Scaffold this active site. Structure first.
Site, PDB file in Angstrom:
ATOM      1  N   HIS A  85       0.855  -1.211  -0.089  1.00  0.00           N
ATOM      2  CA  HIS A  85      -0.098   0.090   0.123  1.00  0.00           C
ATOM      3  C   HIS A  85       0.937   1.229  -0.106  1.00  0.00           C
ATOM      4  CE1 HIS A  85       0.014  -0.655   4.419  1.00  0.00           C
ATOM      5  NE2 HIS A  85      -0.224   0.793   4.610  1.00  0.00           N
ATOM      6  N   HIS A  87       1.407   3.886   2.340  1.00  0.00           N
ATOM      7  CA  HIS A  87       2.152   4.618   3.290  1.00  0.00           C
ATOM      8  C   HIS A  87       3.802   4.282   3.264  1.00  0.00           C
ATOM      9  CE1 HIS A  87      -1.838   4.160   5.904  1.00  0.00           C
ATOM     10  NE2 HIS A  87      -1.753   5.501   5.256  1.00  0.00           N
ATOM     11  N   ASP A  89       5.845   3.061   5.486  1.00  0.00           N
ATOM     12  CA  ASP A  89       6.097   1.666   5.865  1.00  0.00           C
ATOM     13  C   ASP A  89       6.301   0.594   4.890  1.00  0.00           C
ATOM     14  OD1 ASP A  89       3.348   1.954   6.304  1.00  0.00           O
ATOM     15  OD2 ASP A  89       3.429   0.189   7.644  1.00  0.00           O
ATOM     16  N   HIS A 150      -7.220  -1.725   6.057  1.00  0.00           N
ATOM     17  CA  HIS A 150      -6.403  -0.803   6.663  1.00  0.00           C
ATOM     18  C   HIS A 150      -6.390   0.369   5.507  1.00  0.00           C
ATOM     19  CE1 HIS A 150      -2.771   0.974   8.270  1.00  0.00           C
ATOM     20  NE2 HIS A 150      -2.355   0.701   7.077  1.00  0.00           N
ATOM     21  N   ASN A 181      -2.984   2.240  12.697  1.00  0.00           N
ATOM     22  CA  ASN A 181      -3.196   3.616  12.186  1.00  0.00           C
ATOM     23  C   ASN A 181      -4.446   3.418  11.279  1.00  0.00           C
ATOM     24  OD1 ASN A 181      -2.890   6.101  10.937  1.00  0.00           O
ATOM     25  ND2 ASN A 181      -0.891   6.080  11.308  1.00  0.00           N
TER      26      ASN A 181
HETATM   27  C1  LIG Z   1      -1.829   6.787  17.973  1.00  0.00           C
HETATM   28  C2  LIG Z   1      -1.284   5.640  17.021  1.00  0.00           C
HETATM   29  O1  LIG Z   1      -1.068   5.838  15.855  1.00  0.00           O
HETATM   30  N1  LIG Z   1      -1.131   4.185  17.550  1.00  0.00           N
HETATM   31  C3  LIG Z   1      -0.719   3.398  16.581  1.00  0.00           C
HETATM   32  N2  LIG Z   1      -0.571   2.067  17.147  1.00  0.00           N
HETATM   33  C4  LIG Z   1       0.015   1.198  16.065  1.00  0.00           C
HETATM   34  C5  LIG Z   1       0.160  -0.118  16.257  1.00  0.00           C
HETATM   35  C6  LIG Z   1       0.550  -0.870  15.246  1.00  0.00           C
HETATM   36  C7  LIG Z   1       0.796  -0.256  13.901  1.00  0.00           C
HETATM   37  C8  LIG Z   1       0.593   0.983  13.714  1.00  0.00           C
HETATM   38  C9  LIG Z   1       0.682   1.680  12.389  1.00  0.00           C
HETATM   39  C10 LIG Z   1       0.524   1.154  11.192  1.00  0.00           C
HETATM   40  C11 LIG Z   1      -0.549   0.237  10.720  1.00  0.00           C
HETATM   41  O2  LIG Z   1      -1.615  -0.055  11.618  1.00  0.00           O
HETATM   42  O3  LIG Z   1      -0.441  -0.273   9.703  1.00  0.00           O
HETATM   43  N3  LIG Z   1       0.901   2.115  10.061  1.00  0.00           N
HETATM   44  C12 LIG Z   1       1.572   3.120  10.947  1.00  0.00           C
HETATM   45  C13 LIG Z   1       2.274   4.338  10.363  1.00  0.00           C
HETATM   46  C14 LIG Z   1       2.094   4.400   8.587  1.00  0.00           C
HETATM   47  C15 LIG Z   1       0.825   5.536   8.366  1.00  0.00           C
HETATM   48  C16 LIG Z   1       3.479   4.854   8.143  1.00  0.00           C
HETATM   49  C17 LIG Z   1       2.636   5.231  10.975  1.00  0.00           C
HETATM   50  C18 LIG Z   1       2.904   5.209  12.377  1.00  0.00           C
HETATM   51  C19 LIG Z   1       2.173   3.747  13.076  1.00  0.00           C
HETATM   52  C20 LIG Z   1       1.619   2.918  12.406  1.00  0.00           C
HETATM   53  C21 LIG Z   1       0.079   1.799  14.979  1.00  0.00           C
HETATM   54  S1  LIG Z   1      -0.487   3.630  14.998  1.00  0.00           S
HETATM   55 ZN   LIG Z   2       1.387  -0.444   8.438  1.00  0.00          ZN
HETATM   56 ZN   LIG Z   3      -0.535   1.558   6.391  1.00  0.00          ZN
END
Ligand SMILES: CC(=O)Nc1nc2cccc(-c3c(C(=O)O)[nH]c4c(C(C)C)cccc34)c2s1
Ligand SMILES: [Zn+2]
Ligand SMILES: [Zn+2]
Length: 232
Positions: A85, A87, A89, A150, A181
Site C-alpha cells: 500500500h 504508506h 512503511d 487498513h 493507524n
Molecule cells: C496513535 C497511533 O497511531 N497508534 C498506533 N498504534 C499502532 C500499532 C501498530 C501499527 C501502527 C501503524 C500502522 C499500521 O497499523 O499499519 N501504520 C503506521 C504508520 C504509517 C501510516 C506509516 C505510522 C505509524 C504507526 C503505524 C500503529 S499506529
Molecule cells: Zn502499516
Molecule cells: Zn498503512
C-alpha cells in the site's frame, strides 16, 4: 537468538531477517513516527537465483540496511519489489531500491495515493488488481486485492509453495488491542475484506501481519474483531 525480533530489540536503522519457511523470510525494522517507535514487517521470497522483496523497511536508511542484511544473510540479488500500500512503511525506501537497480512495482491505486501523499512512488503499475477478489501472479507469489481495509489499496501476498500468507497492514498481530493507524482505513469494509482473505486462503499455515508477530489463521479473525471493536 531465534525468537521473532521485537520493537525494543531493533534499534532504528538496523534490520533483522527471520526465516519463515524454505525460501521465505520476513524482514523487520523499526522507525519513529509522530514521536513513537514502531516495528514493521516485510517479506523476501526466493525466486530461483534472485529474490522478490515485499515492502520496504520503512525509510531510506532502513532500506539500505535491509539490502545490506540481505547480502550478508542470503547473498542473492533483489531484482523486484512490490509495495502493498501507499504508506511510508511500504514505499519509503523505494528510491533507494530503484537506485540499487531493483524494479519496483505497486498497483495503480497505490501509485496514485503515494504520489498525492508525497511518498515515494514505485515505478511499475500492477494491473489486474482493481476489483476486490482479484488475484495475479508475480514471480513466486500471488498478489490478492481483498477490498478496502487498513487502506483502500492494500494488497495481500500468498506464497503457494510454503502456504505463507503475508497480510500486510490489513492483518494485525494477536497481541494487538487496537486497529493501529486507521487514518486511511475503511472500518466498515475491513471485516468483509478479511472474510475474502479467509475464503481465498484456507490452507495458509503462517500469517504475517504488517506489524508484529506472525502466527496462524487466527490472526485473520482477530483482526476483524479488533477493527469491529474500534469502530463500535
Ligand atoms: C496513535 C497511533 O497511531 N497508534 C498506533 N498504534 C499502532 C500499532 C501498530 C501499527 C501502527 C501503524 C500502522 C499500521 O497499523 O499499519 N501504520 C503506521 C504508520 C504509517 C501510516 C506509516 C505510522 C505509524 C504507526 C503505524 C500503529 S499506529
Ligand atoms: Zn502499516
Ligand atoms: Zn498503512
Amino acid at each position: 537468538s531465534g525468537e521473532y525480533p521485537t520493537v525494543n530489540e531493533i534499534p532504528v536503522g538496523e534490520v533483522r531477517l527471520y526465516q519463515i519457511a524454505d525460501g521465505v523470510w520476513s524482514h523487520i525494522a523499526t522507525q519513529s513516527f509522530d514521536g513513537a517507535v514502531y516495528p514493521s514487517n516485510g517479506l523476501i521470497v526466493r525466486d530461483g537465483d534472485e529474490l522478490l522483496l515485499i515492502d520496504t523497511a520503512w525509510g531510506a536508511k532502513n532500506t539500505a540496511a535491509l539490502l545490506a542484511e540481505i547480502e550478508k544473510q542470503i547473498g542473492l540479488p533483489v531484482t523486484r519489489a512490490v509495495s502493498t500500500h501507499f504508506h511510508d512503511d511500504r514505499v519509503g525506501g523505494v528510491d533507494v531500491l530503484r537506485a540499487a537497480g531493483v524494479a519496483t512495482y505497486a498497483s495503480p491505486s497505490t501509485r496514485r495515493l503515494a504520489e498525492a501523499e508525497g511518498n515515494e512512488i514505485p515505478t511499475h503499475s500492477l494491473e489486474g488488481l482493481s476489483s476486490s477478489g482479484d488475484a495475479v501472479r508475480f514471480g513466486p507469489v500471488e498478489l490478492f486485492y481483498p477490498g478496502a481495509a487498513h487502506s483502500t489499496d492494500n494488497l495481500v501476498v500468498y506464497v503457494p509453495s510454503a502456504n505463507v500468507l503475508y497480510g500486510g497492514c490489513a492483518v494485525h498481530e494477536l497481541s494487538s488491542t487496537s486497529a493501529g493507524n486507521v487514518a486511511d482505513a475503511d472500518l466498515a469494509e475491513w471485516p468483509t475484506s478479511v472474510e475474502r482473505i479467509q475464503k481465498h486462503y484456507p490452507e495458509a499455515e503462517v500469517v504475517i501481519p504488517g506489524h508484529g508477530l506472525p502466527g496462524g489463521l487466527d490472526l485473520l479473525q482477530h483482526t476483524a474483531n479488533v477493527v469491529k471493536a474500534h469502530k463500535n
